Write a protein that binds this ligand. Structure first.
Ligand SMILES: CCCCCCCCCCCCCCCCCC(=O)OC[C@H](COP(=O)(O)OCCN)OC(=O)CCCCCCCCCCCCCCCCC
Ligand SMILES: CCCCCCCCCCCCCCCCCC(=O)OC[C@H](COP(=O)(O)OCCN)OC(=O)CCCCCCCCCCCCCCCCC
Ligand SMILES: COC(=O)C1=C(C)NC(C)=C(C(=O)O[C@@H]2CCCN(Cc3ccccc3)C2)[C@@H]1c1cccc([N+](=O)O)c1
Ligand SMILES: CCCCCCCCCCCCCCCC
Ligand SMILES: CCCCCCCCCCCCCCCC
Ligand SMILES: CCCCCCCCCCCCCCCC
Ligand SMILES: CCCCCCCCCCCCCCCC
Ligand SMILES: CCCCCCCCCCCCCCCC
Ligand SMILES: [Ca+2]
Ligand SMILES: [Ca+2]
Lengths: 219, 118, 165, 534, 59
């Protein structure tokens, strides 16, 4: 379900990608010429010299990994690169503060957007009927029936693999007698209402809410 | 953070070098802050985002119809479709199918996967 | 019956007028009531038991002067006995009565302890009448006063007075 | 052990740089980036999810006891009490005291409120004007402007008390806090003028002086309900925090028991975060809990029990149980507190602002032969040109000045700048160009397209001069990706929901950015240059 | 049985608190070194074992 939620919001992550792109290019053009030397943090591993390198540095900052030492190393006064025929900008505050405040925001925006898209599942009593029970019924139905070949086909009550949750006082017989059987079980096992007229009520509810074969659904 | 917690515990007096563990009580200032701005107020923050998203989502509450679980139930009128399993026909091709489709096979193969990882 | 040229206005208040917690609310409403109806409302203070009304030696001549001033062309009557419509509705004077009530029974004692503890023991006697005022249905509670601040209830009192004028 | 150190995202980048040195820069980044993304961000999203699910179950199960109804009843009661005390106080004014019936209206008047807000701002500016070695005139300015503001704030303390009822003025929580802060100011005057004042005094007294900035943020109502709920449920916040404190005490006593005095290595005493005594053990356990140098505090914990061996290096169990079941309990505590008090304190808002509004409502050129055709092929060609332009500026070479690739990218920039001027010319046929109601300007995205294109062209114009001005005009051409926001009907929805989120969140951001100002000012008081070292 | 009727549970909780405070003051010196305070805390510790074993028997 989380994979589905992630794949159902391809644009909340696109925003994070756009932010990484923007800040990678900005850091490229401003801090690109700092001198690569160790004992600092703009070194042979961290630098804004190529786009992959800058994106790695920004991923390092986003996970909060001594980003302040990079920030202090990109402050002005640093020797410039030799391939450049001094360098270092004081923008390095606004570049590294804001980034951390932006990513850490857009991350949360992403996470919650994925949580709450999915919030139907995360809060769930696991007792009242849910997709798990319906799919378990689908597989047992396939166990007692080959591919799409069940119309009545029933002379047995061996359908007790339906656990206590949806023969107590033969209410199983009442439910069975009173895809069509799937929808009948859906309506009855919920036991929403009991008035003796709920078949026509189900008819009108399905008509108003709905799109498919309703000539068999109510019976 | 801890590189600064210990420059500010050694902190002595205006324009004077450090003294080892001059004041450990200063750590309180760095604890309260950490509890307030980093822990409490940036979890108030995600809590606020969560509750706001839930409000943005309950706009389509639609209380005229009943609770949400029956909404998923009625949306699952699209179930009860066939699933391919290829029940065997040949007798030489059914014994193997049965033995490989029994749980006796899957337990063993979980055991072998674990042994290969080991 | 027939209107005595105007509807006499008395204010029941949250409780008995003999204790400051209530009569202060009456004065507070009366000041603002009088300062916006010049030539439209005459305020008078009555003391005798006008509950015993016909339409006691002191009470003998008390009732008629209210009608006399009502004919003068609405009129505010300030009493010390009308603490419920029942002790005033037995006779059909056809008045309009301002029905002050507090929506909660729990702020009353907090108001009681406010200024001084000398009055404290009367809180029950304070509260019972409010309880005895609580269950009265709106049709005999014609003036509905629910809210907190004066500045809006004073505007609320404006509207009731223009059914005829 | 190394992978688990990476997952917690501290020490992640070392073990990547060491591997980069060992086996080259090429592949290892896949391993470690994927490890962080799958195993750190994703399984933190899952944890936030499961916790929020449990908390939304507990909220609904909290509709059995109806604690929210208790909070609402208390809120209405405390509103009504002051509302009726207004009736009483306005009654008392019928030893002539004609002054009060005017000074009360002055109090309620917005001019006085804005005056006492401007005074708060001056107080802040006299506090924030701290400085390492400020000129000697600034010190006397701050002293006199502190005395004057304290005297005035006491003046509008007593004026507010006497224009209302004392027994009514103390009803409001805010005024009870304000009386406290001005009393703290008076105590400050006493201590500083008697000269018996101590560094703890210069801390707490100036601290309460800062707290007077809370005189702002009293209109704002969502945070008012939030604070009301926090003060309602303090019996549970205290319990949760106290249980956390006991967990930390246990994991610090065990810390001293296992690593007490075992950190003495002949190397220079760089081990500041030892486990020696109890206060220095609490700081170390807290540092592990927040996970700052969890590595080093575990490598020292290991190398104390012999090097990496079998009996030794089972002292990773301590620093792993700690980092697991301390961050879990931190997240649980500080999300239960921050959701069960921020979803009920938003119910207050949704049930009283609604109620109050319901209460008040119930009381009451050429325009011929154009070509806007084929807007379904431009709407994709422009995307597949913006993407290539974005990659184009992603492919520049900073370190070399006259790079071979840079000339080719300049040629691409020529082509793309011309093509992106083509659509600007095209949309003349569409209504706009400050003509026809100015339909051009009503939608800022088209203007932004023109703006970034115009900058890419102004850089060209300056390039003939070839001067360092373009040094900025180059950088801003990073704006090119944002054009997609206009051209992707899906991306527009997300980038608008983000702004809606910002506006809805704004109160919390304001509280936090105003509550960091107090900590900045206290830090300035405490460490105003006491951090040097030779 | 009637001992637990009496509210001593407060005194046993105060014993727990005194044990926490006895553990806080104990400085773990590197190699068997000790000061006077660590010497006294061991006698106080025998006291705490006594007061815990007694209540163990009772409960
Ligand atoms: C925004 C999304 C951007 C996606 C970027 C994906 C890039 C894939 C190819 C990158 C590549 O070529 O890897 C090698 C790179 C640099 O190689 P290097 O040897 O150090 O350069 C000096 C040559 N004399 O070495 C690297 O460090 C690449 C690191 C890339 C990290 C990407 C993180 C994505 C989040
Ligand atoms: C054996 C593995 C047991 C579970 C390990 C879970 C590790 C947590 C996920 C990775 C991580 O990023 O941890 C750091 C996280 C705080 O990280 P951050 O918010 O960036 O600061 O801190 C956390 O999220 C702690 C999460 C604790 C989960 C406990 C699960 C029940 C035990
Ligand atoms: C005002 O920010 C602060 O004082 C903070 C500062 C600067 N340092 C740290 C790291 C904090 C922080 O977590 O930054 C957050 C990161 C996520 C986005 N957050 C809001 C935001 C959204 C979009 C654009 C910009 C900002 C800012 C506090 C803080 C704690 C808790 C809540 C909070 N808040 O802004 O609500 C802020
Ligand atoms: C001789 C005593 C000097 C130290 C007194 C206390 C200073 C250190 C207190 C550390 C508190 C940290 C709290 C950890 C999280 C609750
Ligand atoms: C000299 C050795 C070259 C080996 C090249 C391997 C490339 C990929 C290795 C890392 C892939 C890890 C994926 C993690 C699971 C998604
Ligand atoms: C509430 C607004 C605060 C603005 C004033 C504080 C910032 C400037 C004061 C310190 C500047 C020192 C520069 C050297
Ligand atoms: C929870 C697992 C982490 C720690 C497990 C303990 C492993 C101890 C042995 C590892 C090293 C053995 C000796 C290597 C040669 C120096
Ligand atoms: C409830 C109060 C507990 C305070 C401490 C209790 C135990 C203290 C015993 C030893 C105190 C240290 C001094 C040792 C003699 C010089
Ligand atoms: Ca970290
Ligand atoms: Ca670090």
């Amino acid at each position: 379900t989380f994979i589905k939620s992630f794949q159902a919001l391809p644009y909340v992550a696109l925003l994070i990608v756009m932010l990484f792109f923007i800040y990678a290019v900005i850091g490229m053009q401003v801090f690109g010429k700092i001198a690569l030397n160790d004992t600092t943090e703009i070194n042979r591993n961290n630098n804004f010299q190529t786009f992959p390198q800058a994106v790695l540095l920004l991923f390092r900052c986003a996970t909060g990994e001594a980003w302040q030492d990079i920030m202090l190393a990109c402050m002005p006064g640093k020797k410039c690169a030799p391939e450049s025929e001094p360098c270092g900008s004081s923008f390095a505050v606004f570049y590294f503060i804001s980034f951390y405040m932006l990513c850490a925001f857009l991350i949360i925006n992403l996470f919650v957007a994925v949580i709450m898209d999915n919030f139907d599942y995360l809060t769930r009593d696991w007792s009242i009927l849910g997709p798990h029970h319906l799919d378990e019924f689908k597989r047992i139905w396939a166990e007692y029936d080959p591919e799409a070949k069940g119309r009545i086909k029933h002379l047995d009550v061996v359908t007790l693999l339906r656990r206590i949750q949806p023969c107590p006082h033969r209410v199983a017989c009442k439910r069975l007698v009173s895809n069509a059987t799937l929808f009948a079980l859906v309506r009855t096992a919920l036991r929403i209402k009991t008035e003796g007229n709920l078949e026509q009520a189900n008819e009108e509810l399905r008509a108003i809410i709905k799109k498919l074969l309703d000539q068999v659904v109510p019976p | 953070w801890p590189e600064l917690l210990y420059r500010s515990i050694d902190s002595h007096t205006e324009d004077k070098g450090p003294i080892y563990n001059y004041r450990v009580e200063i750590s309180i200032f760095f604890i309260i802050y950490i509890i307030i701005i980093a822990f409490f107020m940036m979890n108030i923050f995600v809590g606020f985002v969560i509750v706001t998203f839930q409000e943005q989502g309950e706009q389509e509450y639609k209380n005229c119809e009943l609770d949400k679980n029956q909404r998923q139930c009625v949306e699952y009128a699209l179930k009860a479709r066939p699933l391919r399993r290829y029940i065997p026909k040949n007798q030489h091709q059914y014994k193997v199918w049965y033995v490989v489709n029994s749980t006796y096979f899957e337990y063993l193969m979980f055991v072998l996967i674990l042994l290969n990882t080991i | 019956d027939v209107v005595p040229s105007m509807r006499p206005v008395v204010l029941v208040g949250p409780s008995l007028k003999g204790y400051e917690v209530t009569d202060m609310m009456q004065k507070a409403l009366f000041d603002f009531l009088k300062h916006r109806f010049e030539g439209r409302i005459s305020i008078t203070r009555v003391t005798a038991d006008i509950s015993l009304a016909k339409r006691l030696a002191e009470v003998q001549s008390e009732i008629e002067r209210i009608f006399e001033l009502a004919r003068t062309l609405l009129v505010v009557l300030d009493a010390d006995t009308i603490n419920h419509p029942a002790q005033l509705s037995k006779t059909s004077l056809a008045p309009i009565i301002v029905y002050v009530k507090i929506s909660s029974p729990k702020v009353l004692q907090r108001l009681i302890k406010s200024r001084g503890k000398s009055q404290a023991k009367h809180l029950n006697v304070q509260m019972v009448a409010a309880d005895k005022l609580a269950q009265c249905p709106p049709e005999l509670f014609d003036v509905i006063l629910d809210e907190n601040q004066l500045e809006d209830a004073c505007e609320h009192l404006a509207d009731y007075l223009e059914a005829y004028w | 052990l190394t992978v688990f150190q990476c997952i917690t995202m501290e020490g992640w980048t070392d073990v990547l740089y060491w591997v980069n040195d060992a086996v080259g820069r090429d592949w290892p980044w896949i391993y470690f980036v994927t490890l962080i993304i799958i195993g750190s961000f994703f399984v933190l999203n899952l944890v936030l999810g499961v916790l929020s699910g449990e908390f939304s179950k507990e909220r609904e199960k909290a509709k059995a006891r109806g604690d929210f109804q208790k909070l609402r009843e208390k809120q209405q009661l405390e509103e009504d009490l002051k509302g009726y005390l207004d009736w009483i106080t306005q009654a008392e004014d019928i030893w002539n005291r004609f002054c009060r019936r005017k000074c009360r209206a002055a109090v309620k008047s917005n001019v006085f409120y804005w005056l006492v807000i401007f005074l708060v701002f001056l107080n802040t500016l006299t506090i924030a004007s701290e400085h390492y070695n400020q000129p000697n005139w600034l010190t006397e300015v701050q002293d006199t402007a502190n005395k004057a503001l304290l005297a005035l704030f006491t003046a509008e303390m007593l004026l507010k008390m006497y224009s209302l009822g004392l027994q009514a003025y103390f009803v409001s929580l805010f005024n009870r806090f304000d009386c406290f802060v001005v009393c703290g100011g008076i105590l400050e005057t006493i201590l500083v003028e008697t000269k018996i004042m101590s560094p703890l005094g210069i801390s707490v007294l100036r601290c309460v002086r800062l707290l007077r900035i809370f005189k702002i943020t009293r209109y704002w109502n969502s945070l008012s309900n939030l604070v009301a709920s926090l003060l309602n449920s303090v019996r549970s916040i205290a319990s949760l925090l106290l249980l956390l404190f006991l967990f930390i005490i246990i994991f610090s006593l065990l810390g001293m028991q296992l690593f007490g005095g075992k950190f003495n290595f002949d190397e220079m005493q760089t081990r500041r975060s030892t486990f020696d005594n109890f206060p220095q053990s609490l700081l170390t356990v807290f540092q592990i809990l927040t996970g700052e140098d969890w590595n080093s505090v575990m490598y020292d914990g290991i190398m104390a029990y012999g090097g990496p061996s079998f009996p030794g290096m089972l002292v990773c169990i301590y620093f792993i149980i700690l980092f697991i079941c301390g961050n879990y309990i931190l997240l649980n505590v500080f999300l239960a507190i921050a959701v069960d008090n921020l979803a009920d304190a938003e119910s207050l808002t949704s049930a009283q602002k609604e109620e109050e509004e319901e209460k008040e409502r119930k009381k009451l050129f050429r325009l011929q032969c154009h070509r806007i055709v084929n807007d379904t092929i431009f709407t994709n060609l422009i995307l597949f040109f913006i993407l290539l332009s974005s990659i184009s500026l992603a492919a520049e070479d900073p370190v070399q000045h006259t790079s071979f690739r840079n000339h080719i990218l300049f040629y691409f920039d020529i082509v793309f700048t011309t093509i992106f001027t083509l659509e600007i010319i095209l949309k003349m046929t569409a209504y706009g160009a400050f003509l026809h109601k100015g339909s051009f300007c009503r939608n800022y995205f088209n203007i932004l397209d023109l703006l970034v294109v115009s900058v890419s062209l102004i850089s060209f114009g300056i390039q003939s001069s070839a001067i360092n001005v373009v040094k900025i005009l180059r950088v801003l051409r990073v704006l090119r990706p944002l054009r997609a926001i206009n051209r992707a009907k899906g991306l527009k929805h997300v980038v608008q929901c983000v702004f809606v989120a910002i506006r809805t969140i704004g109160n919390i951001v304001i509280v936090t950015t105003l509550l960091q100002f107090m900590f900045a000012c206290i830090g300035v008081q405490l460490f105003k240059g006491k951090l040097y070292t030779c | 049985s009637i001992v637990e009727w009496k509210p001593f549970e407060i005194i046993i909780l105060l014993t727990i608190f005194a044990n926490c405070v006895a553990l806080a003051i104990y400085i773990p010196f590197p190699e068997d070194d000790s000061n006077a305070t660590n010497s006294n805390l061991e006698r106080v510790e025998y006291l705490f074992l006594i007061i815990f074993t007694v209540e163990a028997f009772l409960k």
